[PDB]
Design a protein around this ligand. Structure first.
Ligand SMILES: CCC(C)(C)C(=O)O[C@H]1C[C@@H](C)C=C2C=C[C@H](C)[C@H](CC[C@@H](O)C[C@@H](O)CC(=O)O)[C@H]21
Ligand SMILES: CCC(C)(C)C(=O)O[C@H]1C[C@@H](C)C=C2C=C[C@H](C)[C@H](CC[C@@H](O)C[C@@H](O)CC(=O)O)[C@H]21
Ligand SMILES: CCC(C)(C)C(=O)O[C@H]1C[C@@H](C)C=C2C=C[C@H](C)[C@H](CC[C@@H](O)C[C@@H](O)CC(=O)O)[C@H]21
Ligand SMILES: CCC(C)(C)C(=O)O[C@H]1C[C@@H](C)C=C2C=C[C@H](C)[C@H](CC[C@@H](O)C[C@@H](O)CC(=O)O)[C@H]21
Ligand SMILES: Nc1ncnc2c1ncn2[C@@H]1O[C@H](COP(=O)(O)OP(=O)(O)O)[C@@H](O)[C@H]1O
Ligand SMILES: Nc1ncnc2c1ncn2[C@@H]1O[C@H](COP(=O)(O)OP(=O)(O)O)[C@@H](O)[C@H]1O
Ligand SMILES: Nc1ncnc2c1ncn2[C@@H]1O[C@H](COP(=O)(O)OP(=O)(O)O)[C@@H](O)[C@H]1O
Ligand SMILES: Nc1ncnc2c1ncn2[C@@H]1O[C@H](COP(=O)(O)OP(=O)(O)O)[C@@H](O)[C@H]1O
Ligand SMILES: Nc1ncnc2c1ncn2[C@@H]1O[C@H](COP(=O)(O)OP(=O)(O)O)[C@@H](O)[C@H]1O
Lengths: 389, 388, 408, 398
């Protein structure tokens, strides 16, 4: 009976997933200064089977995030209705206005420049001379192949690319980079890396593997390395907004937009000492789409890297040319939070849910292009509001 | 529903909020390649009244994020049950293990070092000589007083603490820093900044206000200025984990934890060219708590700034001393997403919901201390897993 | 060559043999030998043996140099001097004055290029400059038993009464030592304190270090458990790139500006205002952004800073932070024909008194600019003037290089 | 006579910088320029102490400097011997900062008594990062992809490699910013620092690229993506010039007797100053105590480009407790971007060639091109380590 059972060791004891959640809440309530705190924290009628043992632990319910829609987004001759999970007012409306200006401008074009999730472990040799020897070995075409072999043998999608190594005395940081089908790829690349390091330990028995991640990836921390070499998907997007569209939809001029972009996104960011933060609010857009689509929201740290550029275009130089370059969009359409039904619905809205069996990785690339496009719409709108004052 | 279809202004016309959403979902399905997708996106039985006109537009439903609990967190002689909204496996469990090690260690201590949300507008003058003149005026006690007088006149909770100005030729970037009670403060600081710039314009007519935000705040973009001068709440957290607790709960040694922290969080981050990213995964913890508590998750960019330090402690130097310093936690307990009931529930769990009537700001400071403490628990756990 | 027992005025070969035998270190040759140049000569001969090529030094000068000013002040184990070609760029029309700028360098085209830049500025009606801030810094690192204690010290240092006792201790060390403010940063139980103060006409490193040591003693009386780990915890920050110098400044923060008429851009610079602007934005702003630069938003300010620093006896290693600069260009005038240019340098570490400025040749270069030594009437004015000159010369240099990049 | 030549100039019929070609002797040209400059000064006798007599200006005029009015004497001191890679070096240091040479000398002493230092060159390649523009981001994206294929690379490599004897194009790193494309060219350059050589190779390579993409606009041969003489994370992360690492172990006894401190005190200072302190200051590549002091002193003495001390001084200094009882001091210095050369520029002058000869690296290495420059870079990293050891000890000893 309910009261007779009277934490994580609940789903294993009982049988029904919701029962265990309900018991944990009642248990928790006794340990709080306000037992009625959880009154308004919903938990009923939720599919906990997909969550248990894959996405969360010690579950006591779920947090509802308002989902809005911005669009249509005219990108690469297609139209997208973009789902955005946010609690910030004006965000969805503002982004929507941006999409409008792009559509009335003939749409936006985007390109995926690079694709590759990374993992940067740190190993240490007894002496720097030894670590230097390993670096040189890793750089020989013969040393690389054996490493790519041990790395690729862990998965169908594990296809190791370039190897970026860096030395700090007897320490050696190795940045592994590989595609990962339609998955964001963190778990996959970690597995490949472990196998690859094990193989390297056989050639250099004196090598000590200090940590599978030595912050050289770099994952969820700001880093110049992600900005300069990319991580995940590097994307670029562009569009031209007609002078009339800038005055009527955005309520400003091409000249004012350009002056704000240069002195805010370029000079202002420079004065603030920014690395990769040469935009107005890409993070707002990235975060909203990530939460709605089951992405890892903590990856918004590097995923939001962006340089927004604006310039006079057209016959009379009265048209607004805009481009957004995002070198490190960490994203996926398979695994993690994308395995849940509500987030899968948002992914389906964009036509990128799950794997693309015929062209592996295409769904994730499409999603990355959508994010870059939506960021551009968001940048257009906020810059206009700042310019119009 | 029939010929009602004959846009965002639905609840502006129709009666029920849930009906206005149902209809918006119907209008949208006609533009989708897979109209059946919306079937799994919930929307039923949710208080949209609090959302409409405040937190979101063009609403088509809501996204459920699994909420887990980590704790108890023994911090400043209190115990906290920490709500974490996440879809990443092992996160809540790992953080929970970290809390365990801290409690068995006698708990953690934290201090709020600074408190002040910022806004950094960019203005321009005719010549660099003029912008230099404005900078000099702004740095006098008389000049600051008038600016402060005008800034503080916009709110009861808006109190200008200082000004930091930088010029770039004829451009002048002014960083306004102010307390904001229990609110994260962006809107409040923006209002005060507009009023202050208006007053500055009266002293310098030839001044052009280019943008209320010139990226000098800096908001939601990585910037050395937030790391060096702070933004929102600057917090420091510490704890000592006994040798046996490291061995038994964390499954490693103090020596291995220290070697991993130095070569990963310090040297590794240095090699990667990081500014403010001298930690293992503070962003994971910050994000999870932010989503659960109705914070602005996009502020995870600067809020996650953290330097994790580990040292040998005790009589025999077998104990693990750990500290986490987070100079820029942007947080609040009133307004924005904290106005919604489910997120208010998570805030209530921590005893920091809404405004602290007695001492405005105490709830937000408490929440910031809780975040720094939870990050430290998270850092302990992940470093242990990496060392082992 | 007399025996060692028999051995001021002797034979060179005899001194050498004495050095080898009594194992006397070469650096004692100044306080053992008669004329200054002989001590050097002997050391050159002493070192000449250790070389795989004994005749290496043959072309390294040493004769006819004032070693008295150098010994015990600017260099040790002296074996001669390195001649750096000095060129002149000018006149530089700045703040309604004209300057003939000395530049020590071995890089071809630098002086010529900078000279062309000065020409364009003069024909443009000159340049205007302003000193925005002045204050050398030192950022020591101290430790407390706990983060809670370091937090307590930070709060204490932020009270008006706490700051006053520190300021009193700091200022009691020198006439020009005047503590301006305190920026304090915590990293767990560690506490980094950035001291900032004016220093008359001196660059001020030694002076600020002395003040800092005294102030930390006073602080130690209030917090006996405080451990002073290092008088410099890299929070100054001295001779290393750092966002803190860029954002808060160090030494002298300066801004310079000038408008180059379209006519002058076409004829002297061989390009257009539009091309210059496009190069500046995509190189100095966007390019530097893509490269992950902090404070390097310019074309080659380091070239100019270094050349003037070596010629004027400044500390050339300080070129690391001193070269921080953001170069901005934009359309100006009736028909947006003219080129508006500005250079903002937040951290020029400079001085006209002390260190290498005490030597005669570099004093000559300082005299050329009218800023040699201390300003008796207005302490610090000579150093501020020199900083303004450097910013102005950098702008001239930026104009010229940008033009060469834009044209061809 | 001089009086006559001066009156001719004050007639506007000669600028003043035409003297070397106008006159016969170089030194007299300098003398006349000095007299002319004197009348324009608020204090005419100010040049009194600026030397100029008896200096081989032939090697300078037309190659190293313009409008020459004399020379600036920089005191040269010697630090050593530096026990590095089983060799001994007497290191020349041009400086006006007191205690620098002495301090570095003490550092060398501690290293020698510890069994010497070992160093390795990890990478070698000068760079140039021009910026070009295409009509659209889609076009710049197409060029990036093209440059990434084997065909496009070989074509660019061939054109680059055809400009010089040492032009051997390696990796081609590229970055896009909308319709802008930044291309980082990297190549070895024998024993030369290589700026001019790489610039020449870059110009032709861009010509060849223009034939395949006629709509491409070459905005600047240098778009600050090299990056030359400005602080940049790209040089720290990918290197520029020579990447070097050096290491040594100092016995507990030597740390106590020579450095006047303990290994424990050293380690605590290094971590909290060079790592944590630099982190708090927001440094990129400045994880050392004073590598710039050593780099600058050696650069000036050896005819290097002193302005390159901006990136050349990038360094991470690491210290660790080593040995039987963990009382021995292990130290390492990693410098990813030492821009250096032993041929060309200021190294063409006799006085600086003398300093280079002192180290045995003057000019070209006939047998193995580049070896002299690599040796010099190793010497710089080693001397930096000796300098780091000494300053850290002084900071530790209170
Ligand atoms: C800070 C600028 C501004 C316009 C005053 C502001 O408050 O507008 C709010 C309220 C309303 C007016 C309209 C808006 C339109 C678009 C955006 C979603 C914007 C919020 C932007 C904010 O989330 C991030 C910025 O602070 C980044 C920056 O530009 O520095 C939002
Ligand atoms: C990060 C490498 C590692 C430990 C193999 C890993 O996969 O552990 C996973 C699974 C399990 C083992 C235990 C864990 C404990 C704590 C964390 C929530 C961790 C996920 C880390 C990830 O969210 C970010 C890191 O990649 C950041 C970094 O340390 O560079 C998580
Ligand atoms: C920068 C490339 C370029 C213009 C082709 C070049 O070789 O010009 C040389 C030779 C001659 C043409 C004219 C010049 C004019 C002005 C400067 C002193 C320049 C050399 C600058 C160099 O020392 C640093 C740059 O490389 C910095 C940058 O990236 O802009 C110098
Ligand atoms: C900053 C150190 C200290 C002790 C205050 C100082 O004045 O020592 C001077 C005088 C004497 C004591 C011994 C010394 C030994 C070695 C060096 C050449 C040092 C000058 C260092 C200075 O040129 C750069 C540092 O300031 C960098 C930093 O550590 O932040 C020099
Ligand atoms: N599923 C989980 N949910 C929450 N916390 C967990 C979970 N699994 C482990 N933990 C935490 O991690 C610690 C590890 O203990 P345990 O799970 O028994 O594993 P171990 O074999 O490492 O001892 C526990 O003290 C608990 O706080
Ligand atoms: N204790 C409190 N602290 C802060 N704001 C409070 C408090 N009590 C009430 N408020 C109200 O809440 C407002 C802050 O919310 P909001 O306008 O959304 O701005 P912000 O962007 O700062 O959250 C204040 O202007 C004030 O009217
Ligand atoms: N050899 C040089 N030495 C010094 N300055 C030079 C030299 N060559 C050119 N300059 C500078 O460049 C400017 C331009 O002169 P020049 O190159 O002859 O072109 P033009 O005479 O066509 O304007 C001169 O006013 C001078 O400042
Ligand atoms: N003027 C100097 N020139 C060169 N080296 C010096 C000088 N002063 C000190 N040293 C270095 O310091 C070492 C010894 O330090 P210490 O025992 O304090 O004696 P002292 O300071 O008299 O040399 C010497 O071996 C030498 O490397
Ligand atoms: N061993 C060598 N190493 C380098 N350069 C050499 C060598 N032998 C001859 N050279 C010549 O010297 C040139 C390098 O000097 P220079 O053109 O002044 O450029 P930099 O000073 O920028 O390296 C090479 O392009 C080549 O013509």
């Amino acid at each position: 009976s309910d009261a007779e059972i009277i934490a994580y060791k609940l789903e294993t004891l009982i049988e029904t997933h919701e029962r265990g959640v309900s018991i944990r809440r009642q248990l928790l309530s006794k340990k709080l200064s306000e037992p009625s705190s959880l009154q308004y924290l919903p938990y009923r009628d939720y599919n906990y089977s997909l969550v248990m043992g894959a996405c969360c632990e010690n579950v006591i319910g779920y947090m509802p995030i308002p989902v809005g829609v911005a669009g249509p987004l005219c990108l690469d001759e297609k139209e997208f209705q973009v789902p955005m999970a946010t609690t910030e007012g004006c965000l969805v409306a503002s982004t929507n206005r941006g999409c409008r200006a792009i559509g009335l401008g003939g749409g936006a074009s985007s390109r995926v420049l690079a694709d590759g999730m990374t993992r940067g472990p740190v190993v240490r040799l007894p002496r720097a001379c030894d670590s230097a020897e390993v670096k040189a070995w890793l750089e020989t075409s013969e040393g690389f192949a054996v490493i790519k072999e041990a790395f690729d043998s862990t998965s169908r999608f594990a296809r190791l690319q370039k190897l970026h190594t860096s030395i700090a005395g007897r320490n050696l940081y190795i940045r592994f980079q590989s595609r990962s089908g339609d998955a964001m790829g963190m778990n996959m690349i970690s597995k490949g890396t472990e196998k690859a390091l094990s193989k390297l330990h056989e050639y250099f028995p004196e090598m000590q593997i200090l940590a599978v991640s030595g912050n050289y990836c770099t994952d969820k921390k700001p880093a110049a390395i992600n900005w300069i070499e990319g991580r995940g998907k590097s994307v670029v997007c562009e569009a031209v907004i007609p002078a009339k569209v800038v005055r009527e939809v955005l309520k400003t001029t091409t000249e004012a937009m350009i002056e704000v972009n240069i002195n805010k996104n370029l000079v202002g960011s420079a004065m603030a000492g920014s690395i990769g933060g040469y935009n107005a609010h890409a993070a707002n857009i990235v975060t909203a789409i990530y939460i709605a689509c089951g992405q890892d929201a903590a990856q918004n740290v590097g995923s939001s890297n962006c340089i927004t550029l604006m310039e006079a275009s057209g016959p009379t130089n009265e048209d607004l040319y805009i481009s957004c370059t995002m070198p490190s969009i960490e994203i996926g359409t398979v695994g993690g939070g994308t395995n849940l039904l509500p987030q899968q619905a948002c992914l389906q809205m964009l036509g990128v849910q799950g794997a693309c069996k015929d062209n592996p990785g295409e769904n994730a690339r499409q999603l990355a292009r959508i994010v870059c496009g939506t960021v551009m719409a968001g940048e257009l709108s906020l810059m206009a509001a700042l310019a119009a004052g």
